[PDB]
């Protein structure tokens, strides 16, 4: 009715002042500010270890508390944790679907989570007195496929799925304590605050959104992308986040002033991101793309200082560990790697 | 051994029972048969489930397993999660051809056919299925020949002339489907014709899979 | 999770003998397994081991060529065989279990004893005192001394301190030195450096009396301290 046409034409004016307030508190690019600096040697990072045992394409991987452990997860229905000292292998867990798309490790010690393309996360118990792995808990209830999880606390986690819909939930209970919508098309990843009070969320309508944990409060919106976004990181401070796209892009967001600070493109690269991740200092951002190889990005300057050119696949997961020691890729050739 | 301590040399015996229980357990999954279940809504996909978020299911034919997927539920974009079926032997398609009359829900105008057909030309030219073959069931045959002989297949066929009768049409109607192929030399479609018969379904798709695979083997060492 | 052993009983010298135990509640597969002797004349030291997939198996010098180990994996049962019982072969035995990757607490469960009584180089671990007169409310502190450096290539202490209780079978306190063991209160601890090494406890109550023993475990035969008994 008419009712509808005004609150469209509202609505598309609120739109209209919403892009003019975002617009009118830029001042001056990021790189006009991080130009004076130096850029860093050419970084040159050799295979230290190479984990094998994968039997078909790797999905996820996630480093773990002290640094030392990680997990993977491959569509051969594993889930397998290693010691990257060694390079020995401490648990293998059979898992129900094996549709996977995402793994998270506790930041305790305790608990691993899974799920994927089954609309249930799976949350088990590594620390049991029985000396094996068991399935602590299946968060039921989204309608889409799960594209991301990420423990809050050893009894809080949150999900992000197809439906358009993220939520937060509890382990103990296993029913949802908060849901958050408004995306219109598939949620593709989720990435938690250092101190565990916001995260952010980013889907299939190009379009990434800045949640609330406590309330369910829908803070703030972000675009820029002209097609998927399938990678989320906050900068180790927590005053900024960084996005990787499937039209070759990756940008960097300020949450304090929400505008685009850094788009990291090359015009020899047509084929689109699957994953990015930080360095400790936050200098060094990874970016693990399809044309095979992964690419690591001075994230001051934009411009290159390595390539981890060693893998026969396109590569899917990728992280650094906690006090910075070295960085694990995966690919779909179902080879693990650590660089020092 | 020597330079290892004696809290150090079971870690590794424990790491090599993993890797070999990971290899013993990835060889009963390059031996089974995956097949990728499809239909255009009411197409009679139960039909031909009956005959015989992801729904699995099991069957045995002459001492061959089979793993059947059916994700006609996700209700989701299909490009963000289609690759995970890159590596699978075939492309069921059901579909049932006394539905040319019968609209949509969704259009009056629109009938069932066309979006069918234009279902089976999207499955049939992703990049993920460059040598993937498809193997096409045609349904409710029986009804078909009653609802064609009331009201001409020409509302639906415009551009054609034919006497109205069964052969004819029926053979038409698949020379449009099979005419949207656009590969022709590493793509093969099969087609078969079954209402409700108890015998022909399994047996046809048990041959198409054996050509298949004699086609691999003998591209596998190079002779092809 | 309980392991319960039977085969005890008393000997002749010239004779055979076997000692089973039972795994009743935990992945018993995934499990190294001991046997660790308890002479009735505070005699304490490893006896034999047998890891999870029966590639290994060790004996400590004195009792290599006499005794044979074994699992039953499928029952998830655990076996030692004894074929020569000289007239020093009267004791105690404490079926241990325990597993090794990163992050592990090994000699974890001890089972609960069984008693065998007979008809009538190796690092050396010193406790030189044997008793230490104290009243609760109190710290204490006992003392352990090897013959060379703990501190191995993965920078772990492989000294193992735990406790007995007056008619109660052992339980780990403090494994690797600088860690504690679960289900023990937080009042135990324990610190030192190169060879020599002290258990402390803060408050003292009732239950915290007994005898204290010292483990090394660099390499096979896995050899102790004496004991230090705690008085009221």
């Known amino acids: 009715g008419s009712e509808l046409d005004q609150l469209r034409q509202e609505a598309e004016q609120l739109k209209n002042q919403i892009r003019d307030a975002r617009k009118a508190c830029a001042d001056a690019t990021l790189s006009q500010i991080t130009n004076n600096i130096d850029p860093v040697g050419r970084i040159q990072m050799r295979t230290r270890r190479t984990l094998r045992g994968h039997l078909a394409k790797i999905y996820a991987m996630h480093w773990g508390t002290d640094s030392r452990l990680l997990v993977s997860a491959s569509q051969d229905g594993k889930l397998i944790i290693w010691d990257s000292y060694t390079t020995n292998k401490v648990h293998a867990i059979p898992l129900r679907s094996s549709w996977v798309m995402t793994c998270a490790y506790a930041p305790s010690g305790n608990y691993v989570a899974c799920g994927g393309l089954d609309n249930i996360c799976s949350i088990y118990n590594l620390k049991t007195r029985e000396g094996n792995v068991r399935v602590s808990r299946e968060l039921a209830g989204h309608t889409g496929y799960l594209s991301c999880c990420r423990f809050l606390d050893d009894n809080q986690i949150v999900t992000s799925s197809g439906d358009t819909t993220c939520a937060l939930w509890d382990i103990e209970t296993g029913q949802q304590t908060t849901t958050f919508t408004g995306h219109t098309g598939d949620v593709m990843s989720l990435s938690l605050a250092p101190d565990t009070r916001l995260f952010v969320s980013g889907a299939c309508d190009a379009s990434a959104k800045l949640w609330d944990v406590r309330e369910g409060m829908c803070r703030q919106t972000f675009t820029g992308h002209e097609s998927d976004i399938n990678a989320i990181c906050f900068f180790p401070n927590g005053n900024a986040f960084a996005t990787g796209s499937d039209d070759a892009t990756c940008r960097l967001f300020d949450l304090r002033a929400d505008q685009e600070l850094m788009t990291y493109s090359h015009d020899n690269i047509i084929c689109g991101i699957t994953s990015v991740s930080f360095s400790k200092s936050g200098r060094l951002l990874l970016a693990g793309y399809d044309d095979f190889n992964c690419n690591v990005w001075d994230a001051l300057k934009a411009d290159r200082a390595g390539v981890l050119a060693g893998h026969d696949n396109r590569v899917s997961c990728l992280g650094v560990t906690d006090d910075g020691m070295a960085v694990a890729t995966g690919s779909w050739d179902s080879f693990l790697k650590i660089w020092n | 051994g020597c330079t290892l301590s004696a809290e150090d040399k079971a870690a590794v015996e424990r790491s090599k029972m993993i890797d070999r229980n990971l290899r013993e357990d990835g060889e009963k999954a390059a031996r089974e048969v995956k097949l990728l279940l499809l239909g255009a809504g009411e197409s009679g996909k139960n039909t031909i489930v009956k005959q015989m978020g992801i729904v699995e299911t099991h069957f045995t034919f002459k001492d061959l397993h089979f793993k059947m997927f059916d994700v006609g539920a996700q209700r989701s974009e299909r490009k963000k999660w289609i690759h995970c079926f890159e590596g699978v032997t075939a492309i069921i398609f059901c579909v049932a051809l006394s539905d040319y009359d019968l609209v949509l829900a969704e259009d009056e105008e629109m009938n069932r056919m066309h979006a069918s057909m234009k279902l089976f030309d999207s499955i049939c030219n992703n990049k993920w299925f460059t040598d993937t073959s498809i193997i096409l069931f045609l349904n409710k045959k029986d009804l078909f020949e009653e609802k064609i002989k009331k009201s001409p297949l020409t509302i639906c066929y415009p551009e054609y002339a034919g006497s109205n009768t069964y052969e004819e049409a029926a053979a038409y109607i698949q020379c449009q489907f099979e005419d949207l192929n656009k590969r022709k030399d590493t793509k093969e479609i099969y087609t078969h014709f079954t209402c409700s018969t108890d015998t022909k379904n399994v047996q046809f798709v048990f041959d198409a899979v054996t050509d298949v695979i004699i086609k691999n083997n003998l591209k596998d060492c190079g002779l092809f | 999770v309980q392991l319960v052993e039977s085969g005890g009983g008393l000997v002749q010298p010239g004779g055979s003998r076997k000692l089973s135990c039972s795994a009743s509640?935990?992945?018993?597969?995934?499990?190294?397994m001991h046997w660790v002797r308890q002479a009735p004349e505070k005699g304490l030291e490893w006896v034999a081991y047998?890891?999870?997939?029966?590639?290994?198996?060790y004996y400590a010098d004195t009792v290599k060529g006499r005794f044979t180990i074994s699992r039953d994996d499928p029952k998830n049962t655990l076996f030692l065989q004894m074929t020569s019982l000289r007239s020093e072969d009267t004791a105690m035995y404490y079926c241990?279990?325990?597993?090794?990757?990163?992050?592990?607490?090994?000699?974890?469960?001890w089972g609960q004893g069984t008693t065998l009584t007979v008809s009538s180089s190796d690092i050396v671990m010193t406790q030189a005192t044997s008793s230490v007169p104290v009243t609760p409310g109190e710290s204490v502190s006992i003392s352990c001394r090897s013959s060379?450096?703990?501190?191995?290539?993965?920078?772990?202490?492989?000294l193992y301190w735990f406790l007995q209780r007056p008619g109660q079978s052992p339980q780990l306190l403090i494994y690797?030195?600088?860690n504690l063991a679960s289900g023990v209160p937080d009042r135990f601890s324990g610190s030192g450096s190169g060879t020599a090494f002290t258990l402390t406890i803060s408050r003292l109550e009732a239950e915290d009396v007994g005898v204290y023993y010292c483990?090394?475990?660099?390499?096979?035969?896995?050899?102790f301290g004496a004991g230090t008994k705690l008085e009221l």
């Open positions: 483990m090394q475990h660099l390499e096979y035969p896995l050899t």
């Open positions: 690797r030195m600088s």
């Open positions: 060379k450096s703990l501190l191995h290539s993965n920078g772990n202490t492989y």
């Open positions: 047998i890891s999870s997939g029966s590639g290994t198996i």
């Open positions: 241990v279990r325990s597993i090794y990757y990163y992050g592990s607490s090994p000699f974890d469960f």
């Open positions: 509640g935990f992945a018993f597969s995934s499990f190294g």
